[PDB]
Amino acid sequence: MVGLIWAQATSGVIGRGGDIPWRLPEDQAHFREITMGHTIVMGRRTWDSLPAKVRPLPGRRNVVLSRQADFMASGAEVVGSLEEALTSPETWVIGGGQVYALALPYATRCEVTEVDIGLPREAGDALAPVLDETWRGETGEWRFSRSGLRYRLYSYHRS
C-alpha cells in the first residue's frame, strides 16, 4: 500500500517559497498518527525543509529521493529512484509537489487536510495532485483550529 498524505489550501497550494504557507498544529498531530511507525518517502527539498530538531522525523523510516548520487543526510535513506523508495508494504509519501506527482500512479490511499484559507495559486507554487474519478472519498466535518482556521479531513481510496 502506497499512500499520499498532504495538507492543502482549498486552492490546491501546498507549498510556496520552500515553506508551508500556513500554521495548523492540529494537522501535525493528524500527520503524526497516520505516519508513525511506517516508512515515509519525501523529495530532497521536503527533507531540507524539516526543522533540524526533527530531521529525521522520529519513529519513522525516513526515505529521501534525490538524483544526486552522493547526497547523504543523517538518519535518511537516500535513494535515486522511486522503485527503490517504495519497497515497504505500507509507505506514506509526505511530499513535496514533484514526488506526489511521481508517486500518484502507485498510490491507493490519500489522506488530505483541507485548510480554508484564501491563497490563490501563484506560478512556481507546489501544488497538490489532482484526484480523478478513479478515487472515492469521504469528507470529514469542518473542524476549527486553535488559531482560527477551519480545516477538514478527506480520506480517499481506490482498490
Ligand SMILES: NC(=O)C1=CN([C@@H]2O[C@H](COP(=O)(O)OP(=O)(O)OC[C@H]3O[C@@H](n4cnc5c(N)ncnc54)[C@H](OP(=O)(O)O)[C@@H]3O)[C@@H](O)[C@H]2O)C=CC1
Ligand atoms: N503542505 C504539505 O503537505 C507539504 C508541503 N510541502 C512543500 O512542498 C515544497 C517542496 O516540494 P517540491 O518543491 O515539489 O520538491 P520535493 O519536496 O518534491 O523534492 C524534489 C526533489 O526530489 C528529487 N526528485 C524528484 N523527482 C525525482 C526522481 N524522479 N528521481 C529522483 N529524485 C527525484 C530531486 O532532488 P535533487 O534536487 O536533490 O536531485 C528534486 O529536487 C516546499 O514548499 C514544501 O514546504 C512539502 C511536503 C508536504
Ligand SMILES: CCc1nc(N)nc(N)c1C#CCc1cc(OC)cc(-c2ccc(C(=O)O)cc2)c1
Ligand atoms: C505537518 C505538515 C504536513 N501535513 C500533512 N497533512 N501532510 C504532510 N505531508 C505534511 C508535511 C510535511 C513536511 C513537514 C514540514 C515541517 O516543517 C517544514 C514539519 C513537519 C513535521 C514536523 C514534526 C512532526 C512530528 O513531530 O511528528 C511531523 C511533521 C513536516
Ligand code: NA
Ligand atoms: Na473528520
